Amino acid sequence: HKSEVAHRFKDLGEENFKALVLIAFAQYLQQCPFEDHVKLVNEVTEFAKTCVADESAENCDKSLHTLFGDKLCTVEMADCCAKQEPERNECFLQHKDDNPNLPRLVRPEVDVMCTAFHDNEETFLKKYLYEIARRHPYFYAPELLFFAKRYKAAFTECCQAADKAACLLPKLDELRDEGKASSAKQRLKCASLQKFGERAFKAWAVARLSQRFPKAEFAEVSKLVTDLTKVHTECCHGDLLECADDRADLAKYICENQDSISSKLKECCEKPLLEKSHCIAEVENDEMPADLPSLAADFVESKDVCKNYAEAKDVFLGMFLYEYARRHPDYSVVLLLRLAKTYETTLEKCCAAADPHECYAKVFDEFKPLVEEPQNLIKQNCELFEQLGEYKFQNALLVRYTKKVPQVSTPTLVEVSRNLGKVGSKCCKHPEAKRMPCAEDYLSVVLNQLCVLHEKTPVSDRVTKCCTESLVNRRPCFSALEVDETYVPKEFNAETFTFHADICTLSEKERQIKKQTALVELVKHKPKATKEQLKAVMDDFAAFVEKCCKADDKETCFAEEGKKLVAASQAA
Ligand SMILES: [Zn+2]
Secondary structure, X not given: OOOHHHHHHHHHOHHHXXXXXXXHHHHHOOOOOHHHHHHHHHHHHHHHHHHHHOOOOOOOOOOHHHHHHHHHOOOOHHHHOOOOOOHHHHHHHHOOOOOOOOOOOOOOOHHHHHHHHHHOHHHHHHHHHHHHHHHOOOOOHHHHHHHHHHHHHHHHHHOOOOOHHXXXXXXHHHHHHHHHHHHHHHHHHHHHHHXXXXXXXXXXXXXXXXXXXXXXXXXXXXXXXXXXXXXXXXXXXXXXXXXXXXXHHHHXXXXXXXXXXXXXXXXXXXXXXXXXXXXXXXXXXXOOOOOOOOOHHHHHHOOOHHHHHHHOHHHHHHHHHHXXXXXXXXXXXXXXXXXXXXXXXXXHHHOOOOOHHHHHOOOHHHOHHHHHHHHHHHHHHHHHHHHHOHHHHHXXXXXXXXXXXXXXXXXXXXXXXXXXXXXXXXXXXXXXXXXXXXHHHHHHHHHHHHHHHHHHOOOOHHHHHHHHOOOOOHHHHHHHOOOOOOOOOOOOOOOOOOOOOHHHHOOHHHHHHHHHHHHHHHHHHOOOOOHHHHHHHHHHXXXXXXXXXXXXXXXXXXXXXHHHHHHHHHHO
């Protein structure tokens, strides 16, 4: 590398460069309007084109953070812009806002959108990136490019359809659902790297890829872990151009040699660049090879265990996890990492003592309770889900987690508990030998969100403990939280329980959030009421809404009949 800017302009290409730069600025300055970033991205692009012509031109020598940050600083920001590199980039990164409280964007009419798509395609698609990047500062940048590709394809197709709204809206809504999920899933990776370190990510990545590619050798898996670690490190540090290039190259590497890795990549490697990576990242598990011995020979019984461990602890323990993860796709990543830490801690205390086998021989016995514990949670909560349904299952978990940590803000409790309820719809449909991976690694994402949303405004000593103590053990920690006894009941507030005619016109998603926001506030006001008791109060609520939405005058029904609800409720 002689001049870093131009180099990335050739590798990635103008379309992707411009995109990735727009995403970079959007994530760092989330409050600034669209027209400002467009001007900055344009000026970097035009600048990069001079460096392509001449790598010896003025300022092309500078680093990408310097080039990016100087350009943002022509525009929170005033704090960071006082600084030099690299502390400025750390500032910018610290200043990322998870819930920026931008308005949930209202979509124009489909006829209006398809006009602007044809008349100004470049603008229309640029504004998509902008708006998603702004609300999801931790979004996997190369992924978001693929989202833009899908979003583009949607209009090319549905704008030339007989019915446009019937074509377009279910595609765009489906796409927004994936976005939120991807975003949350990626927010975990960054949190893992940034709060727990590069070992956490490396250990995570060994487990996940070993499960995925069991016919791959250890040395082959360890390479893909190094490459995948680098890619997310760079993406989570704001090196978006370098992340996307390195990710692209890890995809060409894999696809070149599927034989060394897996048999499931036949279809993925016959796809466009953006879609290619997505496919690999989300590929099914390859068939575990049949001729695999017991793990106990090399790792429990052998006479050179402490010898091979002491020679290379991270090599050896990486092999353990490799060997254990490749033959247990039924286990969750985070379950596997507990066992890798259980086996780690055994070898540290016991290689020291002069009787090594006597301790080390009965290690696998320690795993038994760690494997049953998640399986018990999934069997039980999926039972509950299948019995109630998503909405009521959310309502139950809402009561559960509010009773656990009633100090947490109501938007967070409601958003988290709602997303905890979605595990049921995602994972319980699958069979028992494929449930824990789905479920427990989803809960990792959703709990990380509680942690992240809570991190900025900490009001719960329990949530801080469970979030900080161990990345791997979080779900056990949170599950183990019994109902809080210290909590003083919050005093009745008439604004919280005064509802308006607005409720009738809303969506089914939007409607039930409001009702769930009440149910938390009920649990916050009256925490000693049972799960049965509260049902009867929310019963009367729903029927009150129902009759006032069929009213001639809706305004007056919601005001007058509403106060009789709060009177009758507060009594019981
Ligand atoms: Zn960086």
